[PDB]
Symmetry: D2
Subunit: 123 residues, 4 copies
């Protein structure tokens, strides 16, 4: 039983990365898709996780993902332009909590995630 490799961030644009606020855009391509021809769940999550890490960095911190929860609201499609917005909603000494949401070019919600990040040091 064969299935294709899943790649994330073969293209992206960082529109914003400042003080706990991150906006990144990307276009869904063939390497983003699952066997059903929709944006893979792992692809969408990876978008959110990377943007969460980007938020961490924008706070001048180094950290690792400790825990995450994600809801998939609307399918992502080939050639969709996805906007990934990440923001810190709580900054603690050892943990941070980030909200990350993805919307498509028509402004429709694709997925929504919450990340608990473990602070591992200071940039």
């Amino acid at each position: 039983f064969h299935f294709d490799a899943i790649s994330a961030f073969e293209n992206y644009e960082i529109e914003k990365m400042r003080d706990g606020h991150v906006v990144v855009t990307t276009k869904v391509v063939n390497s983003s898709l699952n066997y059903y021809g929709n944006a893979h769940g792992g692809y969408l999550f990876t978008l959110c996780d990377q943007i969460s890490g980007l938020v961490v960095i924008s706070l001048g911190l180094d950290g690792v993902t400790l825990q995450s929860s994600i809801n998939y609201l609307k399918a992502g499609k080939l050639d969709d332009v996805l906007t990934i917005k990440g923001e810190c909603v709580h900054q603690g000494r050892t943990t941070c909590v980030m909200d990350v949401d993805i919307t498509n070019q028509e402004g429709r919600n694709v997925c929504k995630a919450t990340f608990t990040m473990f602070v591992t040091g200071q940039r």
Copy 2:
């Protein structure tokens, strides 16, 4: 600020895939890694999500990921061989719930996830 693309399943072996139980192994490679040289969180999640889909298919169903929660317990390292075990723990009328575990070659727990899948149909 530049960062590399993250790839998943550039290599894998399906050891088991039958009746709601799936076992897949894979090797952590350079495309698996984040900027710190550890297995990317999205990579690990993708391993879990894909094996969850594999569980759905092994039950003779087609489905979509509705919700997922994941805990990252121990870092995945370059050249680690990861074993991904997924099993259905509840089959509802339109939804299924999968437990997925990733352990390394040393038998240490790497991460643990729960997936709520939406059943979209019945396979042929």
Copy 3:
């Protein structure tokens, strides 16, 4: 709110006190005061109490949308301890209303405006 007497039944299991400040179209605001029965052995609002607050308000969001539904999954982050006599504001909002699923965000903040806890509920819609 005789129209939601079921809530008022379950609420007297989860609140020794509460006030609904807002309840309209997927947006709910409820306040409550932390009491002794809310506390664990160490004097903090125990996780089950806070979770139950969020769950109850999530049910309220569902009702405010005119729906019947069942919780499939829930996630909660604990940010700051709740203390005796704290006044907690529990805000619920629908972030996705589908015909088959709903997703609710519930946030709890204290009288000082600090984040107490943050939760998400994944619900299966069962009716009107």
Copy 4:
């Protein structure tokens, strides 16, 4: 174990610790009327609290002090009056700063009732 028993009797009308050894805990309880919602099903908060407290017990059995940082729960099948629930907690990761517990609740017919994961922040030894 004064803290666990205060919290357990303050939240539950009955419980039994059947097993408690080194990150593995088993507790049973019988669903009573106070456990039920207006429609006669076990409250989501009741089930969650069962899981959270058993998670705290797992922490204790490891000889640690900690606080719940994050939790996820999946509701699989409704709990009913007179059901006997078996709540099993297992540590799947004991870290220096965090612990992760897997908690499963099954009923007397062996059916999965709910499944939860708890992320605990370790605050000390105990």
